[PDB]
Amino acid sequence: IKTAPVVPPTEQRDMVQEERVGTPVKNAGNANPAADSDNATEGVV
Amino acid sequence: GRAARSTVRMESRIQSFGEGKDVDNFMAKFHNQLSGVYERRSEGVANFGRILATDTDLGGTSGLSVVFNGLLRGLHHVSTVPTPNVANLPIRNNRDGAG
Amino acid sequence: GRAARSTVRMESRIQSFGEGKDVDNFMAKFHNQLSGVYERRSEGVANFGRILATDTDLGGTSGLSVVFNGLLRGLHHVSTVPTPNVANLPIRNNRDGAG
Amino acid sequence: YKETSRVSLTSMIYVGTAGKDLSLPTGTVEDIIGAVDGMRRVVRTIGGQT
Amino acid sequence: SMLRNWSWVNVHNVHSVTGTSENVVLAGYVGLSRTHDYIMDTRSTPATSQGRRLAAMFYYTNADKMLSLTFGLAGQLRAAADTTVAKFQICPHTIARAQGYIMTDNDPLSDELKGTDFVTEQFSLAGLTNLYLGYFDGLATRLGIYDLRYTYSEYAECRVELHGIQRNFLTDRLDAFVSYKCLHPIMFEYYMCGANISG
Amino acid sequence: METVMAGLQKTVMNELNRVIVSIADVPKLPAHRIRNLIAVLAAVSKPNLGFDANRLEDHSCFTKGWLGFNDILLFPLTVDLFDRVVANEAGVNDAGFIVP
Amino acid sequence: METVMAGLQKTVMNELNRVIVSIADVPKLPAHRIRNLIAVLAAVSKPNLG
Amino acid sequence: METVMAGLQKTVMNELNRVIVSIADVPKLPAHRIRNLIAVLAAVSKPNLGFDANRLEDHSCFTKGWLGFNDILLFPLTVDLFDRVVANEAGVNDAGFIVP
Amino acid sequence: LFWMAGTTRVVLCEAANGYKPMAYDISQTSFWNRENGLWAFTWGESEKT
């Protein structure tokens, strides 16, 4: 048995951190966001 | 390297995390533990202790891809010259404009 | 040997094994068990104990067919010769230019 | 007025009176390797929660 | 000895094994999270058991063992780009047409095609690239590669483009209809398990 | 070291000055092999990996386009990394390997 | 030997540098016959048996 | 360019300093035609299209009444317009290489 | 024909009297060295060579 001094549970707080490597684009779920333009065969106002 | 056209950069950027903390308590833990190594109650130890307590990194352990990217790039560069002389593998030197 | 047309080769391919087995605790067993023969704190006993802890061999002890194949080949080579002389059984030497 | 279209990005080889050729974009890959369906793609999670 | 290594070649015939370029700007490892966790004794050692085996492998492995793995990955990616180039007909004429240029080897033909229904149907380089990255990502995964050329394309600080964009399309117009498939029809079968795209 | 930690501020790109790699314990390697990888880690950050143009007065396929990042700072959390780098493993016990 | 073990490594062909035949206990042959079969064991590796 | 971007500001009329026409990819026109239309794009901002009085010391039917706007700023989002302007295609008279 | 690509509509057909011999017979040419580009008509696959 080894009794060791630890940090009291009430003087620390677990905080969830979300780590990201880059900011997702506007049309993140779209494989081809350029197909709204390539399929505008009548024009756009 | 005449057709590469591809660049890789890494951002060692950080954020600020948490609210309601106590930075003096962590700063005490930091500079007390590393006391047989770096002298406590020092300007450098106080600075680094506060950045550790207040700031966190944004990429994290998921940003090690670039570090391993360039570690393999230099392994490939060295191991693909006909022989690793000083002639085949020059090292970037600080020239004075005149060479 | 004018009409032989058969060759045999053996590959010493090793694979990885032991998804979780704590390499550093085998390296302790290896350099302690073999301390009575080889110097325990050396870079060779740590290196060869690092290989044994991480890599096993692909299809071992079934490629002993080839080794026993070649030990029987040499036995017949030295025995189907008129007399085992140096004139009848040369050994390959290291010839330079002009032999 | 001939209305505008979008290029179909398929083989445009015609073989005369036999009409348009049989378009085999990937050849035999999709029969061996398997259908791909590039339209739906998943951005792998590089980051995470700590 | 450098002319013998094809240093004389047109640098516009050298294709990346993915057919794409890349500009990566990724938020990376700083080390403040790991040093914080060490002082609190929460997660002192972050290296896992699967990483200590992989680490030990790099200690006693020849560096030429890593180049054989990498040059086998490089050709497997070029076989997946060859499939994607062949699917969308990626050639100099196609890419130039995507940018408002009728590029043909026959000079009088491109002048006559201006007044026909050739200009009736149109497409964009952005749309052409987005189809190339979508199909290459799915195909390369099916070959068990898992490359992040599509993940990076969906990050706001990263841009992915086709490789043959920096060339002048008004110059070498006699190679207009030659595809960007780079490897022999037999080295394609070598990688793609007997499958072939041309013959 | 404490001089270095004093000027370890955050830049204007919301970016730390350097990359911190804190070493608590050292993987079992010869001292000379450890010093050699420190040379590599100091050069992995430099543009083109701290390598110069080696073929046709231009960069290779691998060192081209490497822009680099902020220099790695090996910040030992324990004295082990400090006395392993300067360790002379030739003829002395010195709590290290016997490497002839 | 401890220098030779420091040189063992996995080669380009995913093979080991050498072949380790580890002997724990030895058959009781006349010692001059141990030295002769070691000469054989060294030559069986070479092309054409040496 | 980075000096010019430091000078962009909102003016007294709640307007921007310039007009930013940002070009991502460039149409494949002969490079001498890119340099000519840039000359046009610079002059369309000026009063009376940058032209002078060519009849009766007055302005033309089309040139008159054009008050103009703020100067266009060609802002290349990629490097393919910066190298398109300075691209030289003349001097070559080979088949498949000549540009009229 | 296997490297023909493009988005234009062509009609592929064989030319009239298009069957003609090559310039040289590419079967007979091969390289002599792995270290340079010596290349000419070769010979020599005999019972011994």
PDB file of all heavy atoms in Angstrom, chain B residues 42-61:
ATOM      1  N   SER B  42      11.735  32.663 -11.239  1.00  0.00           N
ATOM      2  CA  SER B  42      12.470  33.253 -12.345  1.00  0.00           C
ATOM      3  C   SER B  42      11.492  33.880 -13.327  1.00  0.00           C
ATOM      4  O   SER B  42      10.313  33.524 -13.376  1.00  0.00           O
ATOM      5  CB  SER B  42      13.325  32.206 -13.060  1.00  0.00           C
ATOM      6  OG  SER B  42      14.198  32.817 -13.989  1.00  0.00           O
ATOM      7  N   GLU B  43      11.995  34.837 -14.107  1.00  0.00           N
ATOM      8  CA  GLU B  43      11.145  35.518 -15.076  1.00  0.00           C
ATOM      9  C   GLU B  43      10.699  34.575 -16.184  1.00  0.00           C
ATOM     10  O   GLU B  43       9.542  34.616 -16.611  1.00  0.00           O
ATOM     11  CB  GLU B  43      11.881  36.723 -15.654  1.00  0.00           C
ATOM     12  CG  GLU B  43      11.138  37.446 -16.757  1.00  0.00           C
ATOM     13  CD  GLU B  43      12.059  38.313 -17.594  1.00  0.00           C
ATOM     14  OE1 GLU B  43      13.135  38.693 -17.088  1.00  0.00           O
ATOM     15  OE2 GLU B  43      11.712  38.608 -18.756  1.00  0.00           O
ATOM     16  N   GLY B  44      11.604  33.723 -16.667  1.00  0.00           N
ATOM     17  CA  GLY B  44      11.240  32.782 -17.712  1.00  0.00           C
ATOM     18  C   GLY B  44      10.288  31.702 -17.238  1.00  0.00           C
ATOM     19  O   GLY B  44       9.360  31.326 -17.955  1.00  0.00           O
ATOM     20  N   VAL B  45      10.510  31.179 -16.034  1.00  0.00           N
ATOM     21  CA  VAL B  45       9.635  30.137 -15.510  1.00  0.00           C
ATOM     22  C   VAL B  45       8.255  30.691 -15.210  1.00  0.00           C
ATOM     23  O   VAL B  45       7.251  29.985 -15.347  1.00  0.00           O
ATOM     24  CB  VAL B  45      10.270  29.498 -14.266  1.00  0.00           C
ATOM     25  CG1 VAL B  45       9.564  28.213 -13.918  1.00  0.00           C
ATOM     26  CG2 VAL B  45      11.729  29.241 -14.513  1.00  0.00           C
ATOM     27  N   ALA B  46       8.178  31.946 -14.769  1.00  0.00           N
ATOM     28  CA  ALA B  46       6.885  32.571 -14.525  1.00  0.00           C
ATOM     29  C   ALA B  46       6.137  32.820 -15.825  1.00  0.00           C
ATOM     30  O   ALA B  46       4.914  32.657 -15.883  1.00  0.00           O
ATOM     31  CB  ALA B  46       7.073  33.876 -13.762  1.00  0.00           C
ATOM     32  N   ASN B  47       6.849  33.236 -16.873  1.00  0.00           N
ATOM     33  CA  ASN B  47       6.204  33.478 -18.158  1.00  0.00           C
ATOM     34  C   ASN B  47       5.639  32.190 -18.738  1.00  0.00           C
ATOM     35  O   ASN B  47       4.460  32.121 -19.099  1.00  0.00           O
ATOM     36  CB  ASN B  47       7.195  34.107 -19.131  1.00  0.00           C
ATOM     37  CG  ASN B  47       6.606  34.313 -20.506  1.00  0.00           C
ATOM     38  OD1 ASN B  47       5.397  34.420 -20.663  1.00  0.00           O
ATOM     39  ND2 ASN B  47       7.456  34.326 -21.516  1.00  0.00           N
ATOM     40  N   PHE B  48       6.468  31.151 -18.831  1.00  0.00           N
ATOM     41  CA  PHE B  48       6.015  29.899 -19.420  1.00  0.00           C
ATOM     42  C   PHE B  48       4.950  29.232 -18.567  1.00  0.00           C
ATOM     43  O   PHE B  48       4.075  28.544 -19.101  1.00  0.00           O
ATOM     44  CB  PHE B  48       7.202  28.963 -19.622  1.00  0.00           C
ATOM     45  CG  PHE B  48       6.917  27.821 -20.545  1.00  0.00           C
ATOM     46  CD1 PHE B  48       6.112  27.993 -21.648  1.00  0.00           C
ATOM     47  CD2 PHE B  48       7.452  26.573 -20.305  1.00  0.00           C
ATOM     48  CE1 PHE B  48       5.850  26.944 -22.489  1.00  0.00           C
ATOM     49  CE2 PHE B  48       7.189  25.527 -21.147  1.00  0.00           C
ATOM     50  CZ  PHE B  48       6.390  25.710 -22.233  1.00  0.00           C
ATOM     51  N   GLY B  49       5.007  29.414 -17.248  1.00  0.00           N
ATOM     52  CA  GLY B  49       3.989  28.847 -16.386  1.00  0.00           C
ATOM     53  C   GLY B  49       2.618  29.445 -16.608  1.00  0.00           C
ATOM     54  O   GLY B  49       1.608  28.758 -16.450  1.00  0.00           O
ATOM     55  N   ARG B  50       2.559  30.730 -16.962  1.00  0.00           N
ATOM     56  CA  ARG B  50       1.280  31.395 -17.192  1.00  0.00           C
ATOM     57  C   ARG B  50       0.703  31.068 -18.559  1.00  0.00           C
ATOM     58  O   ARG B  50      -0.517  30.962 -18.707  1.00  0.00           O
ATOM     59  CB  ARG B  50       1.442  32.902 -17.046  1.00  0.00           C
ATOM     60  CG  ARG B  50       0.141  33.646 -16.920  1.00  0.00           C
ATOM     61  CD  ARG B  50       0.388  35.129 -16.933  1.00  0.00           C
ATOM     62  NE  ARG B  50      -0.814  35.888 -16.626  1.00  0.00           N
ATOM     63  CZ  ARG B  50      -0.850  37.212 -16.549  1.00  0.00           C
ATOM     64  NH1 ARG B  50       0.249  37.920 -16.758  1.00  0.00           N
ATOM     65  NH2 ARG B  50      -1.986  37.826 -16.266  1.00  0.00           N
ATOM     66  N   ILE B  51       1.554  30.931 -19.572  1.00  0.00           N
ATOM     67  CA  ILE B  51       1.081  30.545 -20.897  1.00  0.00           C
ATOM     68  C   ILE B  51       0.523  29.133 -20.870  1.00  0.00           C
ATOM     69  O   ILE B  51      -0.504  28.846 -21.492  1.00  0.00           O
ATOM     70  CB  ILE B  51       2.217  30.686 -21.920  1.00  0.00           C
ATOM     71  CG1 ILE B  51       2.648  32.146 -22.006  1.00  0.00           C
ATOM     72  CG2 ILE B  51       1.784  30.166 -23.269  1.00  0.00           C
ATOM     73  CD1 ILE B  51       3.526  32.437 -23.156  1.00  0.00           C
ATOM     74  N   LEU B  52       1.188  28.229 -20.156  1.00  0.00           N
ATOM     75  CA  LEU B  52       0.669  26.878 -19.999  1.00  0.00           C
ATOM     76  C   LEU B  52      -0.685  26.885 -19.313  1.00  0.00           C
ATOM     77  O   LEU B  52      -1.576  26.110 -19.671  1.00  0.00           O
ATOM     78  CB  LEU B  52       1.653  26.038 -19.198  1.00  0.00           C
ATOM     79  CG  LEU B  52       2.738  25.340 -19.991  1.00  0.00           C
ATOM     80  CD1 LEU B  52       3.574  24.527 -19.054  1.00  0.00           C
ATOM     81  CD2 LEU B  52       2.101  24.469 -21.033  1.00  0.00           C
ATOM     82  N   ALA B  53      -0.851  27.746 -18.314  1.00  0.00           N
ATOM     83  CA  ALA B  53      -2.062  27.737 -17.508  1.00  0.00           C
ATOM     84  C   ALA B  53      -3.233  28.372 -18.238  1.00  0.00           C
ATOM     85  O   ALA B  53      -4.378  27.954 -18.052  1.00  0.00           O
ATOM     86  CB  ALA B  53      -1.812  28.458 -16.189  1.00  0.00           C
ATOM     87  N   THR B  54      -2.970  29.374 -19.070  1.00  0.00           N
ATOM     88  CA  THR B  54      -4.023  30.152 -19.704  1.00  0.00           C
ATOM     89  C   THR B  54      -4.298  29.757 -21.146  1.00  0.00           C
ATOM     90  O   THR B  54      -5.437  29.881 -21.599  1.00  0.00           O
ATOM     91  CB  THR B  54      -3.673  31.643 -19.662  1.00  0.00           C
ATOM     92  OG1 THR B  54      -2.338  31.835 -20.137  1.00  0.00           O
ATOM     93  CG2 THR B  54      -3.769  32.170 -18.250  1.00  0.00           C
ATOM     94  N   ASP B  55      -3.293  29.285 -21.874  1.00  0.00           N
ATOM     95  CA  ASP B  55      -3.392  29.031 -23.302  1.00  0.00           C
ATOM     96  C   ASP B  55      -3.339  27.537 -23.584  1.00  0.00           C
ATOM     97  O   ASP B  55      -2.697  26.773 -22.860  1.00  0.00           O
ATOM     98  CB  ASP B  55      -2.257  29.724 -24.058  1.00  0.00           C
ATOM     99  CG  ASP B  55      -2.478  31.214 -24.221  1.00  0.00           C
ATOM    100  OD1 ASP B  55      -3.335  31.615 -25.031  1.00  0.00           O
ATOM    101  OD2 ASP B  55      -1.779  31.996 -23.547  1.00  0.00           O
ATOM    102  N   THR B  56      -4.021  27.127 -24.646  1.00  0.00           N
ATOM    103  CA  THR B  56      -3.942  25.767 -25.153  1.00  0.00           C
ATOM    104  C   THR B  56      -3.772  25.823 -26.659  1.00  0.00           C
ATOM    105  O   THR B  56      -4.120  26.812 -27.303  1.00  0.00           O
ATOM    106  CB  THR B  56      -5.180  24.944 -24.808  1.00  0.00           C
ATOM    107  OG1 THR B  56      -4.999  23.602 -25.270  1.00  0.00           O
ATOM    108  CG2 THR B  56      -6.398  25.528 -25.472  1.00  0.00           C
ATOM    109  N   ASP B  57      -3.226  24.752 -27.221  1.00  0.00           N
ATOM    110  CA  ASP B  57      -3.006  24.719 -28.656  1.00  0.00           C
ATOM    111  C   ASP B  57      -4.278  24.334 -29.398  1.00  0.00           C
ATOM    112  O   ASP B  57      -5.137  23.620 -28.880  1.00  0.00           O
ATOM    113  CB  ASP B  57      -1.857  23.776 -29.008  1.00  0.00           C
ATOM    114  CG  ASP B  57      -2.057  22.374 -28.498  1.00  0.00           C
ATOM    115  OD1 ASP B  57      -3.139  22.070 -27.967  1.00  0.00           O
ATOM    116  OD2 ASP B  57      -1.113  21.567 -28.630  1.00  0.00           O
ATOM    117  N   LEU B  58      -4.398  24.837 -30.622  1.00  0.00           N
ATOM    118  CA  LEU B  58      -5.597  24.651 -31.427  1.00  0.00           C
ATOM    119  C   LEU B  58      -5.567  23.348 -32.217  1.00  0.00           C
ATOM    120  O   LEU B  58      -6.547  22.602 -32.223  1.00  0.00           O
ATOM    121  CB  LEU B  58      -5.774  25.854 -32.356  1.00  0.00           C
ATOM    122  CG  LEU B  58      -6.950  25.864 -33.320  1.00  0.00           C
ATOM    123  CD1 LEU B  58      -8.251  25.766 -32.574  1.00  0.00           C
ATOM    124  CD2 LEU B  58      -6.905  27.142 -34.112  1.00  0.00           C
ATOM    125  N   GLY B  59      -4.454  23.054 -32.878  1.00  0.00           N
ATOM    126  CA  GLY B  59      -4.328  21.801 -33.590  1.00  0.00           C
ATOM    127  C   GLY B  59      -4.171  20.633 -32.647  1.00  0.00           C
ATOM    128  O   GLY B  59      -5.028  19.749 -32.598  1.00  0.00           O
ATOM    129  N   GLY B  60      -3.079  20.618 -31.889  1.00  0.00           N
ATOM    130  CA  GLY B  60      -2.887  19.624 -30.854  1.00  0.00           C
ATOM    131  C   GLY B  60      -2.095  18.428 -31.320  1.00  0.00           C
ATOM    132  O   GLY B  60      -1.185  18.561 -32.139  1.00  0.00           O
ATOM    133  N   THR B  61      -2.429  17.246 -30.803  1.00  0.00           N
ATOM    134  CA  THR B  61      -1.790  16.027 -31.273  1.00  0.00           C
ATOM    135  C   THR B  61      -2.257  15.625 -32.659  1.00  0.00           C
ATOM    136  O   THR B  61      -1.705  14.680 -33.227  1.00  0.00           O
ATOM    137  CB  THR B  61      -2.044  14.876 -30.305  1.00  0.00           C
ATOM    138  OG1 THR B  61      -1.266  13.741 -30.704  1.00  0.00           O
ATOM    139  CG2 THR B  61      -3.510  14.497 -30.308  1.00  0.00           C
TER     140      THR B  61
END
